[PDB]
Structures are given as structure tokens and as C-alpha cells.
């Protein structure tokens with residue numbers, strides 16, 4: 001069974017936060033969704049003032065990382081209408097994460113409505129400046145007051161919101177440099193890298209500091225003896241090139257266990273497939289193929305995809321000691337600009353689309 | 360710079376709870392709490408047991424900036440309470456902290472604080488055969504920020520649980536293991552060698568799969584040669600006559616996918632000290648185990664950890680095929696010897712530098 005949006009309880013706040021220089025993830029809206037689960041099943045969902053959590057010191061969320069999260073954006077169009085981008089995919093992914101951690105199942109459409117209801121309550125937090133959005137952070141945590149390692153008998157689902165600025169505030173895509181060092185592993189086949197679980201991120205903090213120490217902005221996560229490019233930072237990685245077989249192609253790593261199935265990533269594949277102008281494939285990509293392709297001037301554009309930026313160009317990769325220039329910016333970046341344009345059009349209501357869910 | 364035990368703020372409880380055991384559900388009256396931030400560590404405080412108040416954006420809950428430890432205090436016949444090799448836990452906790460970019464601290468200061476805490480709740484430490492006080496330190500990040508970055512805030516706390524005897528009737532009872540290579544606990548280059556919360560959540564579903572398949576625990580296999588790495592949340596040992604005809608005690612080496620257990624190390628030390636057979640840290644593969652079993656060379660297989668000290672293994676389900684492991688048939692002599700000596704040391708029957716008095 002599941003909590004129902006029909007049973008939503010609303011507690012409006014009596015201490016409205018002073019509304020706003022928006023740094024991602026540091027500013028929170030006035031309300032939050034909160035739903036508890038125990039042996040009686042799910043409690044009633046409530047929207048309530050933004051407040052601290054009270055947790056037992058033995059809560060399984062804090063000892064054995066019984067935790068998962070989601071990340072999606074709500075967009076305010078020119079028509080002043082707020083919409084969520086392909087939220088159904090986030091709910092699908094959230095439910096898969098929950099099952100992987102033996103956390104309680106819920107109804108994806110019910111949570112979607114509760115989230116819709118929450119954003120409606122806090123709709124005046126949704127900025128409308130170009131490229132801005134409201135970031136939605138649903139979380140599901142185990143909350144058993146017990147040091148045993150087992151399926152929890154209690155859990156907490158909550159959602160908080162953050163207004164965020166344009167990822168490219170200059171009003172144009174700015175490329176990033178990547179550290180590609182095979183010493184670091186994000187995830188492995190047989191692991192849980194393909195689920196959006198807190199456990200996958202904690203260990204990356206030190207690696208990201210190492211990228212900074214070596215003059216890079218983000219980490220290119222390599223995997224295997226053959227140095228497969230899997231993801232970049234917290235984003236999916238795409239390469240637009242002419243492959244060894246002479247075919248112009250957009251490639252991204254396949255969903256074989258080490259890749260988080262990004263909503264933007266799936267959207268880019270869907271869009272590109274639909275245009276039908278070039279080959280679009282899911283295949284592994286090795287550092288050896290990339291080096292060769294750069295030597296032969298076959299690489300046009302490399303970029304990350306994710307809710308944060310939508311698509312972010314890469315201009316450099318430090319692989320061991322070798323500094324590799326990636327000619328993304330010298331090639332438009334045509335495909336990147338085309339993706340941003342079409343996504344912006346869809347997201348901000350410029351052109352009505354099944355991918356958008358009205359608040 | 361670390362917090363100091365000298366600065367301890369004691370706040371005794373207003374209303375003490377009545378004493379009694381399922382592991383990890385009963386807690387004592389007090390807990391240690393220390394806060395960290397841009398001004399460094401606050402002052403440590405032993406305060407009554409109580410809830411944590413966390414910002415809903417806490418990095419402990421979003422990005423698993425969390426680590427823990429697990430160790431036991433034992434109350435001997437002289438009613439003195441002793442911790443088993445706590446310095447090793449402190450060493451391991453600090454390594455974990457550094458791996459997650461959480462604040463460094465002084466190992467001796469934290470141990471003294473834990474000692475002070477246990478002293479305050481000394482009467483919670485049970486003394487019946489096989490019982491102990493379980494000590495659970497935790498360090499968590501606590502940034503009120505969704506950025507994935509080094510936290511500028513953190514929380515170190517320690518809670519305590521009295522626990523019963525791991526074995527019913529004071530007698531080792533063996534377990535069955537599921538050995539399925541599809542499930543991978545940790546990878547070379549990963550963080551399996553640190554005691555981070557993120558390593559445990561993913562195992563919950565795998566343990567359920569184990570139960571569904573008639574087994575009690577998971578045997579964690581690694582690599583294309585199906586190396587035996589760990590069993591459940593414990594290290595794994597094999598006592599056998601090796602391919603070269605020599606009697607040996609073997610356990611996988613600390614190559615990155617193995618958690619360096621305190622009991623594990625103590626079993627190696629103890630067996631090395633007896634100098635009666637070969638003690639070695641070497642990779643163990645399923646192929647080697649199968650051939651050894653077929654040739655009658657395996658005497659005992661067991662796990663080691665703070666939970667039970669040593670736990671015999673009598674069956675492994677591998678590739679839809681049940682392998683009988685003749686551990687109980689062989690005494691289990693080594694297991695029993697290890698348990699007895701650990702027990703004598705732990706409950707003070709024999710003096711030993713491994714024990715830290717409270």
C-alpha cells in the first residue's frame with residue numbers, strides 16, 4: 001500500500017523565510033513534505049514548515065546508509081506556469097533505489113501529486129529569470145532505532161526545495177576540465193552505482209579534492225583495466241565524434257551496472273534518435289579510443305549531462321600527466337547548443353510537450 | 360586540533376532507565392557528543408541519551424558522510440570493565456574519517472572520552488557468561504547544504520548497548536553461507552577496507568536473498584577466480600593442509616577489499632605466537648577450497664568479528680551446489696582454542712596488554 005495525496009495534511013508556516021546570489025543547495029523554501037512509514041504502513045502525508053529532523057542515535061539512515069535521494073527541476077515558463085521535467089522517470093528511479101535498499105515501496109503517482117502540491121504551496125519561491133529553476137530533493141531513509149543490519153521497520157520520506165540560479169550565469173556554456181585517473185573507482189559491476197544512493201557520493205569528496213589539487217574542475221570516472229569512461233562528476237558523459245568506422249556518432253556508456261540512468265541522458269538519446277541525422281548508440285568508450293580519436297581530429301564535442309546544467313561542455317582532460325585538449329568549443333559546440341535550445345524550449349513552455357508535467 | 364577529554368562537560372541524567380537482549384536495541388543512559396565546525400571541535404560532553412536534531416539537508420543523510428566503529432567492553436569476575444584492543448578501533452575510525460574528508464581528532468582523547476562515558480554507565484555492563492557492552496562510535500558530516508563537498512560541520516557521538524551472549528548455551532553453532540558471484544561487496548580502489556555506512560546498506564537485500572536460498576549469511580566473492588573475501592560483516596579464515604602438504608591458517612590479505620578486523624588481527628597474532636603451524640595472509644579461491652574439500656584437507660572454516668569472536672561454517676551454497684564444510688567434525692579444535700583464549704583475556708582471567716581498563 002501507499003500514502004495518498006487525498007489524505008494530505010497542510011500546515012502552513014508562521015515564520016516565512018526571508019526570500020533572496022543563489023548558491024546551489026544552500027537556500028530552502030518555506031515548506032517540506034514529510035511522510036513516515038512503520039509497521040502500520042505509511043502515515044498520512046503532510047506538508048509542513050521547513051524544520052530540522054529528529055532522529056534516534058541508532059537510526060539505520062546514519063549507521064548503514066539506508067538512504068537514497070532524487071534530483072529534479074521545476075521550471076516557470078514565460079506564461080508564468082511552473083512545470084516539472086519528466087518527473088515520472090525520477091519517481092521510477094526513486095522506487096528502484098528504494099527496492100534495492102529494502103526500503104518501503106510507495107505509489108509513484110501519489111508521491112508525484114504530493115510533490116506537485118508542495119511546489120504549489122511554495123510556488124512563489126520558483127524564480128523566473130532566464131535559466132533559473134526550483135530544485136526538488138526527495139529523500140527516503142531507513143529509520144530503525146537499532147544497530148542490527150537488516151530491513152528497516154521504520155522509514156521517513158521527505159522532500160525539500162531549493163531555488164537555484166542559471167547554471168551558466170554568463171548566459172553561455174562554459175567548459176570544464178576533468179581529472180581522469182584510473183586509481184579512483186566510482187562504482188563496479190555487481191555494485192549499486194546504477195542507483196541514486198547516498199553511499200555512492202560520500203567516497204567521491206576526497207577524489208574531487210584531488211581533481212582540484214591537480215588543477216581540474218571535475219572527475220572523469222574510469223572503470224576497468226581498459227579505462228572506460230563511465231560518468232563525469234555527478235553527470236552522464238557523451239561523446240560526439242566520427243567513429244573508427246567513419247560514421248558520425250553520438251555515444252554514451254550503456255546501462256550495464258556502473259552507469260546511473262540519468263533523466264537528461266535518456267532525453268538526449270530520445271531527442272537525437274528522433275532527429276535521425278546521425279548514429280546514436282550506447283556503447284563503452286575507452287581512454288584508448290578517445291586518445292586515438294583526438295589524434296585523428298575525429299572528436300567534435302564531449303559533454304556531461306545532468307539536472308544541474310542539462311549539458312556541460314568539456315575542454316580538457318588530464319589523463320595521468322598528459323593534458324588532452326578536447327575541441328568541444330572549437331566545434332560550436334553545435335550539438336550541445338542544439339540540445340540546450342530544444343530543452344529550454346520544452347522546459348520553459350515555449351513549445352508544449354508530453355515531457356512536461358504542469359504544477 | 361582535537362577536542363580534549365579534560366574539557367568534558369558531564370550532564371548526568373535526570374531520570375535513569377531501568378536495566379534489562381536482542382543485539383543493538385537496548386541503549387544506556389548516556390552518550391558522548393562532540394560538535395565540529397569552522398571554529399574547530401567544540402567541547403566533548405557526556406549527556407543523557409537523546410535524539411539527534413539534523414538539518415534536512417544534512418550531508419550525513421544525502422551523501423552518506425558517515426562512518427562508525429564497533430568494539431566491546433567486558434566485565435570480569437573482579438567486576439572491572441575492560442575494552443578489547445580499543446586503540447585499533449581508534450586507528451581505523453581515524454582512517455575512515457580521512458577517507459570521507461571528515462575532521463581528524465586525537466585517538467587518545469576520544470578513547471579517554473569513551474572510557475569516561477563507559478565509567479558513567481559502568482552498571483550497564485552485564486557480567487553473565489558471554490555478555491558484554493557494545494560500544495558504537497559514529498562520525499557524521501552535517502552540512503546544511505546539498506553540494507557534494509567537504510563538510511564544514513560534523514558530529515561525533517558514541518552510544519552503548521548491553522548485549523547478550525552471541526551463542527546459546529555457551530557453545531559455538533555453525534552457519535551456512537550463500538556464495539553467489541553476482542553480489543559484490545567491494546572493489547579494488549573502492550572503500551570496502553573502511554568502516555563506512557555506505558558499505559552496509561547494499562548488503563541488506565543480498566542477505567535476504569541468502570535467506571530465500573536456505574542460507575544464513577553471505578560469502579563475499581571477488582574477481583573472476585572467485586576469491587573468498589569476507590563472510591557477512593566478518594573476516595574469513597580457513598584452517599587446512601595446504602597444497603604443499605603444510606598445515607596452515609590462512610586469511611585473505613589486506614589488498615583493499617578486506618576490512619582489517621581487530622579480531623582478525625588478534626587471531627593472526629595469537630596463532631603466530633603459538634608457533635605450532637603456518638600462519639599466512641594469502642588469497643583464497645573457490646577452486647582451491649573445492650579441491651581441498653575433495654581431498655580431505657580442510658579442517659575448519661570460520662568467520663571472525665566483534666559480534667561472535669569466531670563463528671564456524673558448516674555449509675556453502677555455490678553454483679546451486681551445497682558444499683559441506685567439515686568444521687564441526689574437526690572439533691572445531693582451533694575455533695575452540697581461539698574462543699577460550701580470547702575469553703580468558705577478555706574477562707580478565709589472564710592479564711594481557713590487549714585489555715584497556717575502564
Ligand SMILES: CNC(=O)c1ccc2c(c1)nc(-c1ccccn1)n2[C@@H]1CCC[C@H](NC(=O)c2ccc(Br)s2)C1
Pocket residue numbers: 024071135164165166167176218232233234235303304305306307308309312313314505506507
Ligand atoms: C543551478 N545549479 C544547479 O541546478 C545544480 C548545480 C550542481 C548540482 C546540482 C544542481 N545537482 C547536483 C547533484 C548532486 C549530487 C547528485 C546529483 N546531482 N549538483 C552537483 C554539485 C557538485 C558538483 C557537480 N558537478 C558535476 O558533476 C559536473 C560539472 C561539470 C561536469 Br562535465 S560534471 C554537480
Ligand SMILES: CNC(=O)c1ccc2c(c1)nc(-c1ccccn1)n2[C@@H]1CCC[C@H](NC(=O)c2ccc(Br)s2)C1
Pocket residue numbers: 147148149382429493522523524525534559576590591592593661662663664665666667670671672
Ligand atoms: C551478542 N551479539 C553481538 O554482539 C552482535 C551480533 C551481530 C552483530 C554485532 C554484534 N555487530 C555487528 C556488526 C554490524 C555491522 C558491522 C560490523 N559488525 N553484527 C552484525 C549484524 C548482522 C549480521 C552479522 N553477522 C555476520 O556477518 C555473520 C555471522 C556468522 C558469520 Br560466519 S558472518 C553481524
Ligand SMILES: *Cc1c(COP(=O)(O)O)cnc(C)c1O
Pocket residue numbers: 071196231233234235236260261262263264265305306307308
Ligand atoms: C543523478 C545522477 C546522474 C543523472 O542525472 P539526471 O539529473 O537524472 O540526468 C548521473 N550520474 C550520477 C553520478 C548522478 O548522481
Ligand SMILES: *Cc1c(COP(=O)(O)O)cnc(C)c1O
Pocket residue numbers: 429554589591592593594618619620621622623663664665666
Ligand atoms: C567490522 C567489520 C569487520 C571486522 O570486525 P572486527 O570486529 O573489527 O574484527 C570485517 N568485515 C566487515 C565487513 C566489517 O564491517
Ligand SMILES: [Cl-]
Pocket residue numbers: 086087088089354355
Ligand atoms: Cl517522460
Ligand SMILES: [Cl-]
Pocket residue numbers: 444445446447712713
Ligand atoms: Cl592493541
